Amino acid sequence: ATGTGLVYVDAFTRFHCLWDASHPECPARVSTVMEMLETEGLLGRCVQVEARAVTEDELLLVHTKEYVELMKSTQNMTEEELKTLAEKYDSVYLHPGFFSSACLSVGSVLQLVDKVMTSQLRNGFSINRPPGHHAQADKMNGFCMFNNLAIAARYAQKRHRVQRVLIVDWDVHHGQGIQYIFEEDPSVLYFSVHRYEDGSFWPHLKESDSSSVGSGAGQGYNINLPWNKVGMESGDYITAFQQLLLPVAYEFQPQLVLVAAGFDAVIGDPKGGMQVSPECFSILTHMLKGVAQGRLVLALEGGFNLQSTAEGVCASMRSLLGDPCPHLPSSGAPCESALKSISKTISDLYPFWKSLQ
Ligand SMILES: CC(/C=C/C(=O)NO)=C\[C@@H](C)C(=O)c1ccc(N(C)C)cc1
Ligand SMILES: [K+]
Ligand SMILES: [K+]
Ligand SMILES: [Zn+2]
C-alpha cells in the first residue's frame, strides 16, 4: 500500500460533439488536467496505470443487456442515426468513438480498484471521460453512457470480495444514476451533495431531495444533501462532511471509497454557482483517507471550467500523494442555508444511523 495511481489515455480525447465545436464536455477537459498535473510536478510523482476496456459481463453488473447492445451498436451508426438516438436522452451527445472511449473510461476505474484492493497502491485517480454518475441501467444521461463508479463498486464486491462500498459524489450535480442503481442495495452507500434549489437546478428531480433515503433494504443507504441557495463555500462542504458524511461513513465501515470527483462546485465554474476553493478538495480528500484504510479511488465526473477543474484535480491529487493540507482561503463556518440543508438531511436519515442521534 504505497503510491498513488493515475490512469490517462489519449482515447479520452478522441470523441467530441460533432455539431458543436464549442461543446462544454470536450477533450480539453482531460488534456488541461494532464497539462497542469505535469507543470505542478504531480504527474511524475504518480504511478502510471494502464487503462483497459470494460467487458460485457462487467457492464452487465449495472446495465441491461438491451442497453449494452444498443450502446455497442452506436460505433457503426451514421451521424443522423446518432443524432436521432441522442435526442431520446437528456443532455447527451453521441459520436462514433463514444462507446470505445466509454469502455476505457469504465475500465480505467477498474484498473485502479485492482491496484488499490491488492495493496499495490494506496489510492488513485482516473482522469477519465466520458463521465459516469448520471448513466442509468438502460439509458444515457447528462453526457454519460456507462456508470463508471457504479460498475466499479459492484466489480470490487464481486472480484475483490468487498462487502461495503461508499460512493461520495461532490460534483455540483446529483448523480441520480448512482442513486437509482443502488436504491435498494444496503451494501453500497451513496452520498451526494449537490445544488438543488428546490428542484429548479438540473437534473430537476424531486428524487434529488433528502427525502429519498433508499427503498426496501436500501433504506438509509442513500443520502442526498441538497443546497437551496447558490454561493456555498468551503466551510459549508467541511460542515457537511463533519456532521453528516463522516459520521455515517465511520458507522458504515466501508472497505473501499469511490469518489465521483466533479469540480463544478469550484469557484470559476460557468454554471455550478458555488464558491468552493480548490483547496477545499484537498481537505475533503484528506477526510476520506481516514475511512477504509485509505483505499480511495477518485474518478473525474463534471466541471466545465478547464482551469478550475484542473485546479480541483491537482488539489485532490496533492492529498492523495500525502502532501500537507493547504491553507484554506475562506472561512471555516457554514452559512445558515447550508446548516438548514444539513439539519434536514440529518432529520431524514436519523432513524438509520446511530451516529446522527
Ligand atoms: C448535464 C450538464 C452537466 C452535467 C455535469 O456536470 N454532471 O456532473 C449540463 C447541461 C444541463 C448543459 O449545460 C447543457 C449544455 C449544452 C447542451 N447542448 C449543447 C444541447 C445541453 C446541455
Ligand atoms: K453530487
Ligand atoms: K444504496
Ligand atoms: Zn456536474
UniProtKB/TrEMBL annotation:
The keyword Cell division does not apply. GO terms for cellular component: axon; centrosome; cytoplasm; cytosol; dendrite; nucleus; perikaryon. One of its GO terms (biological process) is definitive hemopoiesis. Signal peptide: none annotated. One of its GO terms (molecular function) is tubulin deacetylase activity. Zn(2+) 1 binds at D171, H173, D264. Its main location: other. Keywords: Actin-binding, Cell projection, Chromatin regulator, Cytoplasm, Cytoskeleton, Hydrolase, Metal-binding, Methylation, Nucleus, Phosphoprotein, Repeat, Repressor, Transcription, Transcription regulation, Transferase, Ubl conjugation, Ubl conjugation pathway, Zinc, Zinc-finger. Belongs to the histone deacetylase family. HD type 2 subfamily. This is Protein deacetylase HDAC6. The chain holds residues 60 to 416 of 1081 of the full protein.
